[PDB]
Design an enzyme around this catalytic site. Structure first.
Site, short mmCIF file in Angstrom:
data_model
loop_
_atom_site.label_atom_id
_atom_site.label_comp_id
_atom_site.label_asym_id
_atom_site.label_seq_id
_atom_site.Cartn_x
_atom_site.Cartn_y
_atom_site.Cartn_z
N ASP A 73 0.81 -1.10 0.02
CA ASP A 73 -0.08 -0.16 0.04
C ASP A 73 0.83 1.35 0.13
OD1 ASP A 73 -2.60 1.65 0.48
OD2 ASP A 73 -1.49 2.03 2.16
N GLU B 137 1.57 -0.62 -4.79
CA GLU B 137 0.75 0.61 -5.33
C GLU B 137 1.78 1.76 -5.43
OE1 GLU B 137 -1.50 2.64 -2.75
OE2 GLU B 137 -2.94 3.63 -4.24
N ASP C 17 -10.22 2.34 -4.88
CA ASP C 17 -9.65 3.56 -5.00
C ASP C 17 -10.50 4.31 -6.06
OD1 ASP C 17 -8.24 3.77 -2.53
OD2 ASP C 17 -6.49 3.03 -3.49
#
Ligand SMILES: CC1[C@@H](O)[C@H](O)[C@@H](O)[C@@H](N[C@H]2[C@H](O)[C@@H](O)[C@@H](O[C@H]3[C@H](O)[C@@H](O)CO[C@@H]3CO)O[C@@H]2C)[C@@H]1O
Ligand SMILES: CC1[C@@H](O)[C@H](O)[C@@H](O)[C@@H](N[C@H]2[C@H](O)[C@@H](O)[C@@H](O[C@H]3[C@H](O)[C@@H](O)CO[C@@H]3CO)O[C@@H]2C)[C@@H]1O
Ligand SMILES: [Ca+2]
Ligand SMILES: [Ca+2]
Ligand SMILES: [Ca+2]
Ligand SMILES: [Ca+2]
Length: 404
Positions: free
Chosen positions: A180, A205, A291
């Protein structure tokens, strides 16, 4: 054969009876669809309901998704069908449960009896002045405003996070990681955790803004964007690393391409324009995630063209990732499973060869490994470009796939 599946959305934490428990009834369909890895949400206690503001990392029973027992049961069910489990690892920042003599929340709690992960302000990046004591190193990456950023250059931090990560594997059954907010720390630091925990894969990410033009659309030449991504992979170890990245370049381009501009799907050298075109073995492609889509909708794929997005990623090189909602909530289960079946049947993998046959505004046609042909776009007739011997295998709204 490798196909990922994000097994949660932004509303998952609210599931009556627990998300993991609910997922037990979804395991068989996921496996039957040809999925090889399922990405699960942050498992630890978190100040925020979704889990992206972790505190007591070892306190799995505090999660809104479910406790250790329920998670172990889900991972076991997945493993029983040959499917691996990817844990969403959030380590850029962390919330401290307790206050120090200064009255600042900088005393952390790992969630166990001993001092594991019981850090102090010395482990907080010195430039995160609200919480730090100024003795730490400077942040190796970007900052997360809502919580203390962790100093990954700290030896104890590296040591204890790796121990915790290994515990996730040995005690819960996790196989791989999803890093993350990887922009929060350097790829050199991500390398420490990847190399030290031996995940089957570690997809990070790394999300940078995509440059746009006067019309508000992304620029055709996105080399700078994918360059940043390949640079991250090089620094993490390249081919000698289990690390890889989400292909945000392809996501950004595809978002715009399906809106009558499929000519965006090829670079000047004849390759795919995203990371897929330069390092497909390290590119995890996707249509949407929690997201970009879901309830946050930060960069949603045009809703009427979602299946064009899947026809593209599920037939092309790179490693495709399917989003929970599109498979179980929207009515695309059968259509998505049929595409994965074509991918598997023809031995298509992340490094399969890509030959683009047409890249006009209303039509994109490509041939993969000289065995599969795919077409997307509003232009119905592309028969003249389909090589001899190919027969339609699957088709839907503005997409079709051929096999031999
Ligand atoms: C497989 C692979 C790795 O081994 C390599 O270390 C990566 O950096 C990347 N290598 C990329 C370059 O990072 C990129 O910048 C561009 O390289 C371009 C230059 O950008 C251009 O200015 C002149 O031509 C080069 C052709 O190779 O494509 C290459 C395939 C490649 O995916
Ligand atoms: C005779 C013939 C060829 O000339 C054509 O090139 C083929 O691809 C196929 N034509 C296919 C479409 O290529 C496919 O995409 C789907 O057609 C889709 C449309 O593409 C979609 O935009 C709306 O739904 C239709 C389903 O009925 O089935 C048709 C039978 C047809 O057998
Ligand atoms: Ca403790
Ligand atoms: Ca911070
Ligand atoms: Ca975020
Ligand atoms: Ca940071």
């Amino acid at each position: 054969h490798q196909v990922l599946f994000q097994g949660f959305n932004w509303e998952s934490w609210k599931q009556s009876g627990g998300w993991y428990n609910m997922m037990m009834g979804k395991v068989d369909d996921i496996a039957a669809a040809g999925v090889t890895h399922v990405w699960l949400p942050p498992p630890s206690h978190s100040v925020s309901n979704e889990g992206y503001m972790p505190g007591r990392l070892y306190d799995i029973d505090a999660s809104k998704y479910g406790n250790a027992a329920e998670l172990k049961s889900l991972i076991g069910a997945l493993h029983g069908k040959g499917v691996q489990a990817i844990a969403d690892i959030v380590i850029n920042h962390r919330c401290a449960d307790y206050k120090d003599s200064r009255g600042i929340y900088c005393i952390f709690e790992g969630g166990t009896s001993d001092g594991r992960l019981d850090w102090g302000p010395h482990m907080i990046c010195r430039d995160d002045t609200k919480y730090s004591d100024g003795t730490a190193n400077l942040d190796t990456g970007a900052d997360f405003a809502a919580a203390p950023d962790i100093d990954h250059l700290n030896d104890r931090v590296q040591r204890e996070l790796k121990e915790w990560l290994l515990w996730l594997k040995s005690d819960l059954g996790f196989d791989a990681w999803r890093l993350d907010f990887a922009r929060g720390y350097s790829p050199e630091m991500a390398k420490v955790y990847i190399d030290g925990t031996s995940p089957s894969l570690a997809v990070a990410e790394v999300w940078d803004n995509m440059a746009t033009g006067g019309d508000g659309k992304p620029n055709y030449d996105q080399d700078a964007h994918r360059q940043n991504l390949v640079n991250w992979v090089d620094k993490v170890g390249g081919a000698a690393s289990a690390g890889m990245v989400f292909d945000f370049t392809t996501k950004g381009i595809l978002n715009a391409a399906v809106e009558g501009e499929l000519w965006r799907l090829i670079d000047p050298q004849g390759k795919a324009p995203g990371v897929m075109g330069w390092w497909p073995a390290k590119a995890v492609t996707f249509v949407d995630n929690h997201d970009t889509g879901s309830t946050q909708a930060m960069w949603p794929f045009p809703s009427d063209k979602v299946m064009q997005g899947y026809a593209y990623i599920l037939t092309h090189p790179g490693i495709p990732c399917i989003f929970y909602d599109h498979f179980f909530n929207w009515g695309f289960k059968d259509q998505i499973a049929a595409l994965v079946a074509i991918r598997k049947r023809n031995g298509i993998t992340a490094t399969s060869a890509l030959k683009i046959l047409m890249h006009e505004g209303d039509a994109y046609v490509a041939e993969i490994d000289g065995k599969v042909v795919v077409k997307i776009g509003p232009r119905y007739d592309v028969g003249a470009v389909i090589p001899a011997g190919f027969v339609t295998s699957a088709h839907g709204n503005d997409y079709a796939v051929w096999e031999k």
